[PDB]
Paper text:
The three major rotational states identified previously (termed States: “State 1”, “State 2”, and “State 3”, assigned to describe the enzyme operating in an ATP hydrolysis direction), in which the central stalk is rotated by ~120° relative to peripheral stalk, were also obtained in this study with resolutions of 2.9, 3.1, and 3.0 Å, respectively. Hence, masked classification focused on the Fo stator was used on each of the main states to reveal sub-states describing movements of the complex along with increased detail in the Fo region. Importantly, this rotation describes a ~36° movement of the c-ring in the Fo motor without any corresponding rotation within the F1 motor: the α3β3γεc10 subunits are rotating as a rigid body relative to the Fo stator, with the movement mediated mainly by changes in the peripheral stalk. The focused classifications of States 2 and 3 also revealed sub-states, however these showed only torsional flexing similar to that seen in Sub-states 1 B-E, and hence no movement of the c-ring was observed within sub-states of States 2 and 3. Thus, across our maps of E. coli ATP synthase, the rotor (consisting of the subunits γεc10) was observed in four discrete rotational positions relative to the Fo stator: one in each of States 2 and 3, and two in State 1. By contrast, in States 2 and 3 the spring is close to its relaxed energy state in the observed single Fo rotary states, and the adjacent Fo rotary states are inaccessible because thermal excitation is insufficient to stretch the spring through the required 1/10 of a revolution. The maps presented here were generated from material imaged in the presence of 10 mM MgADP and all showed the enzyme in the “autoinhibited” state, with the C-terminal domain of the ε subunit (εCTD) in the “up” inhibited position interacting with the F1 catalytic subunits.
Author numbering:
A (entry chain a): 4 to 269
B (entry chain X), E (entry chain Y): 1 to 52
C (entry chain H): 3 to 69
D (entry chain P), F (entry chain I), G (entry chain Q), H (entry chain O), I (entry chain L), J (entry chain N), ...: 3 to 79
C-alpha cells in the first residue's frame, strides 16, 4: 500500500466534511477552509447511537411490567435505578427534568466512548475498499464539536435554573458579593465568579474531548507504527484500560452535571 | 480539532433527544417500578391488619 | 528500672520493678523501656512478657485491658 | 523554522504540567478516600460518591490546559 | 506495509479482548442482573404469602 | 515570525503552573474534607457546603492565569 | 521586535508562580479549617471568621505579584 | 535542520513530567492502601478492588501525555 | 538595546518566587493555627498574638525580595 | 553536529525525571509498608505480596520513560 | 552592557530561592510550634525560647544569600 | 572543541537528578524504619532486613542513571 | 569578558540551591524537635543535645557548596 | 573560552542538586529520629546507631555527585 505511516496517522484525524457551498466529500490530501463543513461521520454515528438508545428504552417503557421483569428489562430497570438514586441523593429540588437529562448524558456518552473500542481500521477499510467512500473516523466524543455542544447546553440550563429558582436579584447578589460579600470588593468578585462560572462547562467539554481523542490517537499510533504481530501485545492492555476510561468519563460527566444544577438551584 | 457548524448540529439533535426521553421514557419506567414497590409493600399491610 | 502494676477490677496480678515489657497493643505490638513518654492504649488478649530487675523474666496472660 | 517547534515545546509544557497537577492531586484525594474506607467500610459507597463529587473539581483546569495543548499541537501545528 | 497484515494484528488483539471480556467482564454483569431478578421474585413471593 | 509564537511559549508557562497550583490546591483541600466525612458521616452535607465556600476561594488566581493565558493566545494574538 | 514579547513572558512567569503560591496556601489553610470545623460545628462561624482573616494575609503578596503582571501588560506593555 | 531535536527535547520533557506525576500519584495512593491493608486484612481484596478504580483516574492524564510524546517523537519526527 | 527586557524578566521571577515562598509559608502556619484554635478556642487571643509574632519572622525575606523587585521595576526600569 | 549533542540533553532530562519519579514513589510506598510490617509482623509476607503488586503499577511509566531514554541515546544517539 | 543583564538575573534568582527557603523553613517550624502552644498553653514562653534558638539556624544560609545578593546588585552593579 | 563540554552538562543533570531521587527516596524509607525501631527495639534486626530488601528496589533506577552518567561523562566523554 | 557573567550566575544557582536545602532540612528537623519538646519539656535539653548532633550533618553539603560558591565568586571572579 | 564557565556551571548544577538531595534526605530521616528519641529517651544510643547506618546510604549517591563536582571543578573546568 502506497501509504506512508507518517501520513496514515494524519489522514485518520482528518474528518469527512460536507461543504455547505459545494456539498462535497473532502479528503485528507487538501483541506478546504470555511466554517460550514459539517463533520458527516460525527452527526450520523451520534444520532445512530442516540436513537438506538431511545428506541430500546422506549420499547421497554412501552411493555414494562410490575411483575417479574425479563432479563433485558432487568438490566434497563437496573440502570434506571442507578441514575434515580444518584439524582435523589444529589438533588433535593423538585424539577422533573434533571433525571432524564442525566440518563441521556450517561448512556449516550457511554455509547459514544464505546464507539472507539471497535478496531480503528475495520470501518475505514469497509468504507474505502468495499464501499469506495473517501474518508471515515467513527467516534463522536473524540471531537471538540460534540463535547462543547453538550457543555454549552448545560451552561444554558445553569442560567435557566438559577434565574428560575432565585432570580436576577439573588443571582447577581451572589456574583457580586460572594466570595468576599464585601461591597468594597464587588469588581473582584465579579471577575472571580464570572470565570468560575465559565470554567465549569469548558472543563466539562475538554475533559471528555481530551480523554477520547488521545485514546483514539493511541489506537491510531499502535496500528500505524508497530509491526502487526507485535501490535496485539500492546493493544490488548490499552483496550482493557480504555474500558475503565470510557466508563468513568461518562459517569463523571453525568455526576458533575447534576452537582452543578443542584448547586445552582439551591 | 478546529471549531465547526457541527456544534449547532449536535445541539439540535441533543435537545430533541432530551425532550423525547423526558416525556416518553422516564415517567413510564419509574411508574412501573414504583407500582411494583407499592404492591409488594402493601402486602405487609395485609400482615399489619391481620395481626391487629 | 520502673515500677509496673498489673491490676484487675477484682485483684492485683503483679507488682514490681521491671526492666522491660513486650505488649500486643491493639494497633500493633509495643515495647516499654524506662523513661518511655506518657502513653495510653488498649491491648489485645495474649501473653505479656515481663523482665524483672536482675533480668528475671516471667510471663503473665492478659485477657485484654488498657495500658 | 521558528513557527513550528516553539508551539511543540509550549504544548509539551502545558501537557506535562497538567499531568503533574492532575496525578498528584488525584493521588492525595484517593489516599484520603482509602484511609476513610478502611476505617468505615459501610460508608464505602457513600465515600466513593463523595470522592467522585470532589474529584470532578480537581482536573477541571488541568483539562483546560490539556485541551488547549491538543488544540495548539493539532489545530495550529 | 500490509494494511491487511496490520488488520490481522488488529483482528488478533480484538478477538483476545472479546475473549477476556466474555470470561471476566460480562459474567459479573449477568450475575448482578440475575441477583436483581432474584430479589424481585422473592419480594413478590413473600408479598403473596402475607396476603394469604 | 517569532513575534506570533513566543507568546504561546509564555502562555504554556502561565496556565501550566496555575494548573498544578489549583489541582494540588483542590486535591489537598478535598483530602481533608474526606477524612472529616469519615469521622462525621452524618455531618457531610454541612461539610460539603463549607467545602464549596472555601473551594470558591481557591479558583481566583489560577483562573486569572487561565484567562490571561487564553487572552494572550487569542486576544493578544 | 521581541523586546515587547519578553515582557509578556515575564508577566506570564510572575502570574503563574503567584497562582501556585496562593492556590497551595489556601488549599492547606482551608483543609485545616475543614477538619477543625468537622470536629466543632458550633465553632464554624468563628473558625470561618479566623479563616477569612488569615486568608487576607495569604492573598496579599500574590495580589501584588498579579497586579504587577497586569501593570506590565496594560501599563508598561 | 535543527527542528528535529527541539521536537525530541519537547517530547522528553513531556514524558519526564508524566512519569513524575504517575509515579508519585500512584505511590501515595498505594501507601494509603497498604496502611488500610495492614489494619483490615480480610478487607484487602475489597480495598484492592476499590484501589484500582481510582488508580485508573490517576493514570488517565499521564497516558495522554505519553501518547502525545510518542506522536511527536515517532510520527512528526 | 536588549538591556531592559532581561531586567523585567529578573524582577518578574524574583517576586514570583517571593510570592510562592510567602504564600505557602503563611498557609502552613495558618493551618496549624486553625487546628489549634479548634482545639483550645479560649486561647485564640494568645494564639493570635503568637501567630502574628511568627508571621513577622516568616515575611522578612519575602518583603526584602519584594522591595528589590519593585525598585528594579519602577526605579531602574 | 548539535543534532547529535542535544539528544544527550534530552536523554538526560528523561532519565533524571524517571529516576526521581520512581525513587520517590517507591520510597513513599516502602515507608508505608515498613510501618505496617513493624506493627503487624505475622502479616509481613502477605503485605510483601501486596507491596510487590502495587510497586508493579508504580514503575510502569518510569520504565516507559527510561525505555525511550535508551532508545534515544542508543538509536538516534 | 551585556554584563548588567546577567548580574541582575543572578541576584534575582539567588534571592528568590532564598525567599523560598527561609519562608518555608520557618513556616514549617512555626506550624509545629503553634501546634505545641495550642496543645500546651503554659509552656509558650519556653516554646518561644527554643523556637527562636532553632530559627537562628534556618536563616543562616538564606542570610548569606541575601547578603551576597545585595552585594551583586549594589556593590558590583 | 564544541562537542564534549555540553556532554559535561548532560552528565551533570543525569547524576544530579539521580542524586535527588535516591537521597530523598531512601531518606523517607529509613525514617519509617526508625519509627518501627522506636516502637519495637526488640524487632530492630528483622525490620532492617526488610528495609534492605525494599531499599534495593528504590535505588534501581538511580543506579541506572548514575551508571550511564559515568559512561557518558568518563567514557564517551 | 563574558566569563564573569556565568561565574556570577553559577554562584547564584549553587548557593541558592544550598540555601533551600539547608533551610527546609533544618525546618523539618526543628519541627519534629519542637513537637517532641512540647509533648514533654523535661526532655528539652536532652533533645536539644541530640538535635545539634543531627544538625551538624544536615549542614555538611550545604556549607561545602557555599565554600565552593564563595571561592568561585570571589577567587575565580 | 566558553568551555571554562560552562563547566563551572555544570559543577554548580551537580553541587546544587546534591545539596538539595542530602539536606532533605537527612532532614526527613533525622526528624523521624528525633521523634523516636522523644518516644524512648533512654534508647538514644541504639537509635543513633541505626540512624548512622542508614545515613551512610542516603549520603552515598550525593557524595558521588560532590566528588565528581570536585573532579570537574578542580581538574577539567
Amino acid at each position: 500500500e502506497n501509504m506512508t505511516p507518517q501520513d496514515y496517522i494524519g489522514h485518520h484525524l482528518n474528518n469527512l466534511q460536507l461543504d455547505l457551498r459545494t456539498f462535497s466529500l473532502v479528503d485528507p490530501q487538501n483541506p478546504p477552509a470555511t466554517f460550514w463543513t459539517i463533520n458527516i461521520d460525527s452527526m450520523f454515528f451520534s444520532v445512530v447511537l442516540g436513537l438506538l438508545f431511545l428506541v430500546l428504552f422506549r420499547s421497554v417503557a412501552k411493555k414494562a411490567t410490575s411483575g417479574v421483569p425479563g432479563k433485558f428489562q432487568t438490566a434497563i430497570e437496573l440502570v434506571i435505578g442507578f441514575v434515580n438514586g444518584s439524582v435523589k441523593d444529589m438533588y433535593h429540588g423538585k424539577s422533573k427534568l434533571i433525571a432524564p437529562l442525566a440518563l441521556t448524558i450517561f448512556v449516550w456518552v457511554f455509547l459514544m466512548n464505546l464507539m472507539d473500542l471497535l478496531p480503528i481500521d475495520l470501518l475505514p477499510y469497509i468504507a474505502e475498499h468495499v464501499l469506495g467512500l473517501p474518508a471515515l473516523r467513527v467516534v463522536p466524543s473524540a471531537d471538540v464539536n460534540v463535547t462543547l455542544s453538550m457543555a454549552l447546553g448545560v451552561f444554558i440550563l445553569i442560567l435557566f435554573y438559577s434565574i428560575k429558582m432565585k432570580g436576577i436579584g439573588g443571582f447577581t447578589k451572589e456574583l457580586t458579593l460572594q466570595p468576599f460579600n464585601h461591597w468594597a470588593f464587588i469588581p473582584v468578585n465579579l471577575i472571580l465568579e464570572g470565570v468560575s462560572l465559565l470554567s465549569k462547562p469548558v472543563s466539562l467539554g475538554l475533559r471528555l474531548f481530551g480523554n477520547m481523542y488521545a485514546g483514539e490517537l493511541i489506537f491510531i499510533l499502535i496500528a500505524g507504527l508497530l509491526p502487526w504481530w507485535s501490535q496485539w501485545i500492546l493493544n490488548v492492555p490499552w483496550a482493557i484500560f480504555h474500558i475503565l476510561i470510557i466508563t468513568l468519563q461518562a459517569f463523571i460527566f453525568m455526576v458533575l452535571t447534576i452537582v452543578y444544577l443542584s448547586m445552582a438551584s439551591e | 480539532m478546529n471549531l465547526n457548524a457541527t456544534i449547532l448540529g449536535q445541539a439540535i439533535a441533543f435537545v430533541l433527544f432530551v425532550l423525547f426521553a423526558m416525556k416518553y421514557v422516564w415517567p413510564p419506567l419509574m411508574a412501573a417500578i414504583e407500582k411494583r414497590q407499592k404492591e409488594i409493600a402493601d402486602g405487609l399491610a395485609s400482615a399489619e391488619r391481620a395481626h391487629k | 528500672t520502673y515500677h509496673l502494676d498489673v491490676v484487675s477490677a477484682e485483684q492485683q496480678m503483679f507488682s514490681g520493678l521491671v526492666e522491660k515489657i513486650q505488649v500486643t497493643g491493639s494497633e500493633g505490638e509495643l515495647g516499654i523501656y524506662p523513661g518511655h513518654a506518657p502513653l495510653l492504649t488498649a491491648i489485645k488478649p495474649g501473653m505479656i512478657r515481663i523482665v524483672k530487675q536482675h533480668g528475671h523474666e516471667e510471663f503473665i496472660y492478659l485477657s485484654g485491658g488498657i495500658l | 523554522n521558528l513557527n513550528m517547534d516553539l508551539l511543540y515545546m509550549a504544548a509539551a509544557v502545558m501537557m506535562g504540567l497538567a499531568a503533574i497537577g492532575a496525578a498528584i492531586g488525584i493521588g492525595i484525594l484517593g489516599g484520603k478516600f482509602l484511609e476513610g474506607a478502611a476505617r468505615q467500610p459501610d460508608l464505602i459507597p457513600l465515600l466513593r460518591t463523595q470522592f467522585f463529587i470532589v474529584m470532578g473539581l480537581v482536573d477541571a483546569i488541568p483539562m483546560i490546559a490539556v485541551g488547549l495543548g491538543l488544540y495548539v499541537m493539532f489545530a495550529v501545528a
